[PDB]
DNA sequence: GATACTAC
DNA sequence: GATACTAC
């Protein structure tokens, strides 16, 4: 004859929780009219394959009700002493789900029954839990026993796109192959002693300039007769069968990249890297991406003093990377290998540098490597011939279960 | 874009057809593949008069069973079930009295007071070999010997206060009837530490008491019994194959490079066959590339060794090498295979020095067993975040490897990559799952370190127990 | 017509469970493997033992 | 949390009525919780042939 | 009952009557686990 | 598909089976020979075939010749290599005469 | 003795002859009524 | 799974060097027909190849 | 005369 | 302190 809205709200909450369970699979099952405590039992599926692991779930819902100490993170809640004991002597773990219709919000928390009485006061958070597709491995982690002789859980959750270390390079229209003006080593000394601008856009292999630039001015045509200019399509040598042309084009690209730094990215020799340079003694900041997520300060150069006194300098750290200039099936690529460098008085190559490099390589997990490759991509993509691309993205099939592992990698 | 695949962790066959992916749990759950007909494996100990009782105390200590120090990661640190009743080997290890020998302190000082580095190691290995040979021709013959070393010795043979001690002793012990095993003092006594040659103001570190015992007892059982503990599970109806692994090494007198090979196949019953050859293959210069005639002879020897057991020629031949397949060494193999009418062939180069990598947004690296087709080549991750140990064991980032097939191999790179991935957890020296190199490459590399000191006109055995 | 005898068998098994009283519960359409989950009531005051 | 025999006998009666409907080649199905004193619905079925008579 | 405690599994269940009746008789057990010669 | 097959043992050699019989003419007095071949599949199967040709006549004795006995063996050995990619290690021949 | 119960024509256990000769006799039973130049099939389902 | 035939690279290499046109087509169709016939006489007969 | 919603 | 389901 008359039915209040509270049971309606509860039934809606139970139905939406069941649908949220079903939209990830997991074969959620209902309950009879004789329920007491546990509101449902959920299996675990993996792409349609059952695994016979079950979790007990209790469902709570509200409409327009504000939770106790409602804020960004606090979200406290009070349980019942008489019901808890029902969840104490149980085989399956029991979880609690909270649902709100006003913001369409789902949350979950597992009740702890390790060795002592229950805390009775849940202090759940919104950054964690939140009952989305994430944190599905940490929910499924409560099926295996603590002993765990075998009996692992497959990585639930399907697909996540990753990237690769490689960079496409779009070549310019022409090069500037020239006539025979060969010099083994004096070709760098003539520009070294000259008073003109210094450039390293060339290599002497068989008597040719090998330049990307016009050999007309800027101290470039003092070694070769200016009448000899050649440029047709760059379809004869960069896409050519034999390997001598390939590994001389690699050196041409390396020299072209070496000239186009202008930040005094000094070239070492024992590791083939460009190891930065601070103009002034403090930390030298770098590119900020500003992709509407964070300011992303770089703090590249670091200064470290002695263990007890701040006067004398212990060491100064800089970032660097090594190129490779690889290729398959046209479209020459660049490979970036990030590396650290150590100086003593700013301009000093140091001589006990290996233990510091090994100790820092002991730290700096893969997230630092991904951030460094993103930084090095975004730093130099801001005259010509630097037509860099984006790191190619590949869609993997299995997501790494990072949710079930807490912290301290 | 690029086409990517993720393979599952392959299974191993141990015990009564029981299958699993962890050697520890498989051995503890179903026993070894080939069981011992007898009941007792006898062990002899050679060394100082202090390390022998240490070995005995270790044996009666680990007989009852030790516990692992894992609470957060229990799959990574499982307990040792013992050596009786609940044993994972279904056998008992006994040290028979009269099979032990001790080295006097009178002659352990003359070793320590020799200015030259060569004759000290020579007299040490000569004394140990003489004691073992005297033990051989009698009624106290053991199944496997232990050469547990003291600390005062381990300041001349190792710290040198300069040839190798293991590669010479394992070469001088080739004519005996039993294999040998070398153990340092820290493994058997957990109260002493040994410095590490240079920067001696420190001490070397080892694993816990439960991680040592699994590897030590598995190696001892395989060396003493002679029956293999596990093997890779064969699939459904597939063509019969014979795997060959080829690697190189350097002689320890100069800069000459030599080559080594290893053979393996399946049996008519239930058992793996892994062995080497009773010959060396000369030098022919300094290059890390083999000639044509020796490759043809190797292929002929593998075919003959298969036909002696199976009475028929195989269907396919799989060859793995740590070098590029040159156009001269890829013709002798073809000729030797076409002299016998073998149809399916495969030739793969495994490269370990490659730069390209896959990066993720999290704090953990990619899964173990990731494959990306880089336009006719394969990038395989044989180490990574294994979702069975519960973490990624190690620091920094894993190292992938590249598979490059020859142009006369009739198989796609994905099938070859899966076959290479299935051949990793065959190492009987260790019971760990995070293994990077295939078994033929490891077996080809392990033979060379013992072949380095064999010499000219000596006995070379094809038994793998003399090398593992 | 085998679906009707499967349904009859499942209903009779549930009735046999409910006669002594153990709070048996069925499953949905796409069930594969386990057909039901049962509790132990122990003459009132049910305990979570499935 | 001591349950009574009343819910037991109610569930037993509902299950037995469902079984008797099932053994006659009918189709009976129970309702939810928001039902208005109205239990499930039955459908007349021939030999493996529904007729949509409820 | 399916044996969920051994190693390799065992098929061929041998179901004998009387002792394995699903009735009130066996409930606590159900809830317990919670030459001769010839001539030519 | 085949319902059942004989269980192989453990450790045997690969083998192929041939069977030879004889039969009279339709109405006259001559004698031809007949043959059937049999072996084991690579997976879980069995192969049981006859041939694709008639073996002609040679008289009224229930006995083959030196030319009709070779061709059956060649066909049997050629059928095995098309499936297992290698020759068998054993040949088993059964006959009544 | 092992090759006796591989007769797919019958489900009996008291077979006397081995399978290959039985198959040869069954083939030769019907191979005698095929005319000259006609087709012969190697499938065993057309003889059993 | 069992109704799949793979021609070896040696056979395709053998029919890549026969300078008679009709002959090479004859060996190709003979090889494919032999594989199909071996498939037909077995217990893995498909419905369409 | 006991069990399930929710708001107080 | 609000509205529903079994029967005694
Ligand atoms: Mg609820
Ligand atoms: Mg070893
Ligand atoms: Mg018939």
Numbering used by the authors:
A (entry chain F): 3 to 384, 398 to 424
B (entry chain E): 2 to 162, 179 to 485
C (entry chain J): 7 to 56
D (entry chain B): 3 to 56
E (entry chain J): 112 to 145, 161 to 166
F (entry chain I): 244 to 340
G (entry chain I): 438 to 485
H (entry chain M): 98 to 146
From the article:
The short Argonaute-based bacterial defense system, SPARDA (Short Prokaryotic Argonaute and DNase/RNase-APAZ), utilizes guide RNA to target invading complementary DNA and exhibits collateral nuclease activity, leading to cell death or dormancy. In this study, we investigated the SPARDA system from Novosphingopyxis baekryungensis (NbaSPARDA) and discovered an unexpected filament configuration upon target DNA binding, which strongly correlated with collateral nuclease activity. Based on these structures, NbaAgo is divided into a MID domain (amino acid (aa) 12–50) and a PIWI domain (aa 250–485), while DREN-APAZ is divided into a DREN domain (aa 1–146), a bridging loop (aa 146–161), and an APAZ domain (aa 161–442). Collectively, these experimental results led to a detailed working model of NbaSPARDA that highlights the importance of the transition in assembly form during the activation process. gRNA loading, tDNA engagement, and guide–target heteroduplex propagation lead to the “monomer-dimer-monomer-filament” transition of SPARDA complex.
In the substrate-bound complex, the catalytic pockets of DREN.2 and DREN.3 face towards the filament, while the catalytic pockets of DREN.1 and DREN.4 face towards the solvent and are bound with two substrate ssDNA molecules (ssDNA.1 and ssDNA.2), respectively. Detailed structural analysis of the substrate-bound complex revealed that the DREN domain adopts a PD-(D/E)-XK fold (αβββαβ), with β-sheets flanked by the N-terminal helix α1 on one side and a short helix α2 (aa 83–91) on the other side. The catalytic residues, D41 (β2), Q60 (β3), and K62 (β3), align on the surface of the DREN domain to accommodate the substrate ssDNA for cleavage. D41 and Q60 coordinate a magnesium ion that points to the potential scissile phosphate group. Loading of substrate ssDNA causes minimal structural changes in DREN, with an RMSD (root-mean-square deviation) of 0.8. Firstly, although cleavage of each ssDNA molecule is catalyzed by either DREN.1 or DREN.4, each ssDNA molecule is stabilized by both DREN.1 and DREN.4 through interactions between main chains and phosphate backbones. For instance, ssDNA.1 contacts the main chains of K65, S63, and G39 from DREN.1 and K4 from DREN.4. Secondly, DREN tetramer creates a positively charged and symmetrical pocket to accommodate two ssDNA molecules to form a pseudo-duplex, allowing formation of promiscuous base interactions (such as base stacking, wobble pairs or base pairs) between them. Although the sequence of substrate ssDNA is not palindromic, two ssDNA molecules still form a pseudo-duplex, and this symmetry-forced pseudo-duplex formation likely stabilizes both substrate ssDNA molecules to promote the collateral cleavage activity. Alanine substitution of the catalytic residue D41 abolished the collateral nuclease activity in vitro and the defense against invading DNA in vivo.
